[PDB]
Subunit: 61 residues, 4 copies
Amino acid sequence: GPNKETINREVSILRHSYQKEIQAKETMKEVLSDNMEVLSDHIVIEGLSAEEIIKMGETVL
Amino acid sequence: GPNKETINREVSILRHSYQKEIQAKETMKEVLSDNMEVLSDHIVIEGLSAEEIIKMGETVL
Amino acid sequence: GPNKETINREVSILRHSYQKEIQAKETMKEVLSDNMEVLSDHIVIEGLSAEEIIKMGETVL
Amino acid sequence: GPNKETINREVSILRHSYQKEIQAKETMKEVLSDNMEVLSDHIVIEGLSAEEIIKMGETVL
């Protein structure tokens, strides 16, 4: 019924799949790197403290 | 022909594959937890209403 | 080893992982919505044209 | 037990699940595109130096 060319056809694209998964973590990684450098840039300071800004985000959105 | 070692292989990576997935929603929920943090950081401000601001630039980009 | 139960395990988890994937596409579109807003938000205006600054940083990084 | 059909669903939704993984890469490459513009556009200069705000961000952030 089955055929060695079938079990392999699966196990084949099977390894290729995992690949995309690990390559993924490599992408989402570069992202957070960006989201991170950002928070640092807009991290207000002096004259205004992120806390005061939150105070405006605590009363009402 | 087919060999119990080959079905087990694909089934082995299978379990590992799911792992990456769940650990994916984890790093994902983080990417947003940050993105939102920055958004809710500025938030609408009297005088510097982030909302009103956006409008001003929506009239003529 | 070869037992319709083992291939069914790979197929059953398949639909499960699939769901997570499509759903992921949903959380992805979100990352953009939060991005376009984060961009159209800080987009400075009146005083410093996002173009003038952007260009200035173009001459050199 | 072994049904060349039950495999077809598997080996078929297989080549499919793939087209998804690479698809998500399409949305991902999209995110970065906006992620970059976001940072590259807010790159503040003259008055506030990201280098300074980066120094405080190096203290422990």
